[PDB]
Amino acid sequence: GPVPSRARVYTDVNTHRPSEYWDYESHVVEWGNQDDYQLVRKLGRGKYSEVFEAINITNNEKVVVKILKPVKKKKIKREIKILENLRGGPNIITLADIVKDPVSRTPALVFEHVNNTDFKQLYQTLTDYDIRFYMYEILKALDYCHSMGIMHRDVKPHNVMIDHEHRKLRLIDWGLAEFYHPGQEYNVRVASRYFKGPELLVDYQMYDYSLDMWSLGCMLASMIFRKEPFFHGHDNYDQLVRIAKVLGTEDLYDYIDKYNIELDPRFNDILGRHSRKRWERFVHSENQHLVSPEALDFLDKLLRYDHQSRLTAREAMEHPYFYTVV
Numbered sequence: 229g230p231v232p233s234r235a236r237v238y239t240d241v242n243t244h245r246p247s248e249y250w251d252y253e254s255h256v257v258e259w260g261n262q263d264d265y266q267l268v269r270k271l272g273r274g275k276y277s278e279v280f281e282a283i284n285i286t287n288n289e290k291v292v293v294k295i296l297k298p299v300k301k302k303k304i305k306r307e308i309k310i311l312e313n314l315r316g317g318p319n320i321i322t323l324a325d326i327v328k329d330p331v332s333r334t335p336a337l338v339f340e341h342v343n344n345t346d347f348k349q350l351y352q353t354l355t356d357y358d359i360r361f362y363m364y365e366i367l368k369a370l371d372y373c374h375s376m377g378i379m380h381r382d383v384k385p386h387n388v389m390i391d392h393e394h395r396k397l398r399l400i401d402w403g404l405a406e407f408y409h410p411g412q413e414y415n416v417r418v419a420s421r422y423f424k425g426p427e428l429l430v431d432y433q434m435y436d437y438s439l440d441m442w443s444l445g446c447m448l449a450s451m452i453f454r455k456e457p458f459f460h461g462h463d464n465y466d467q468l469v470r471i472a473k474v475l476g477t478e479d480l481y482d483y484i485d486k487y488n489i490e491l492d493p494r495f496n497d498i499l500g501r502h503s504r505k506r507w508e509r510f511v512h513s514e515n516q517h518l519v520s521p522e523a524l525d526f527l528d529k530l531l532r533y534d535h536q537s538r539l540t541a542r543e544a545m546e547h548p549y550f551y552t553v554v
């Protein structure tokens with residue numbers, strides 16, 4: 229069968245804590261009064277969630293209300309428990325209240341408001357420095373949640389809110405987040421296609437916090453090379469092929485040999501043979517002002533097939549790419 233794996237950092241944080249911390253199924257959720265909140269406007273729509281800008285009428289303060297289509301109670305409980313556990317962590321979205329509609333009884337999560345700047349105007353004005361600055365703010369959030377025994381599992385630009393004027397960053401949407409337990413086999417149907425780590429695409433279930441480090445490398449590559457998304461797969465199988473077109477098929481076979489992974493037969497006719505590409509080949513006139521040897525060394529240490537060989541969030545924060553920050 230497949231070779232077992234465990235995280236290189238924060239491996240046993242949940243093992244040494246009481247069940248109350250990680251047993252989200254047994255957590256008691258207490259709903260506030262939705263009458264304290266007046267919905268202003270629709271901010272977005274997810275699979276089972278509608279996000280609104282709201283007013284807390286009791287203090288005239290702006291909040292964000294995430295109304296969830298209750299399709300799975302267990303999932304809702306998991307998200308609430310994780311949000312409560314992480315509350316007050318650096319750059320983590322703050323859950324302020326948990327409420328139900330007196331009538332429809334739909335669950336709704338109330339969060340601190342984030343004045344997210346339009347990224348379409350932001351992407352062109354961001355400098356080498358701004359990318360280093362915001363990448364470090366995301367690392368703060370990830371080192372924190374991993375130290376708390378949680379993996380986000382949905383790291384992507386749509387889950388990162390930036391108030392550029394106040395240089396404020398928040399990692400949101402903890403709906404796919406999970407407690408890390410060493411040796412546990414997780415569902416690979418997590419993260420958004422372009423940000424899915426090779427472990428997920430080869431169906432290697434014993435993954436850890438390092439999944440988030442792959443996803444972060446994908447956002448970093450798209451930002452520094454101005455190529456969105458960086459790995460543009462059309463399905464989950466093709467997504468591995470797009471990765472192999474960059475990292476090469478040689479290191480891919482080394483990774484699946486190391487963990488005795490059985491490669492799905494659907495990869496037989498699409499994978500082909502690809503050489504390992506130098507990161508310098510993605511440098512062009514449109515992006516050379518954001519690229520540096522430090523950035524390429526940093527990216528090379530995140531985008532690795534072997535989830536164990538990737539930098540942890542703490543090792544990443546210590547990289548020379550961040551010397552000019554904070």
Ligand SMILES: CCC[NH2+]Cc1ccc(-c2ccccc2)c(Cl)c1
Nearest residue numbers: 347359362363385386388447448451
């Ligand atoms: C509602 C869409 C929110 N998205 C905002 C956003 C999120 C992340 C980034 C970012 C990605 C990589 C490195 C540095 C920053 C940016 Cl530029 C913009």
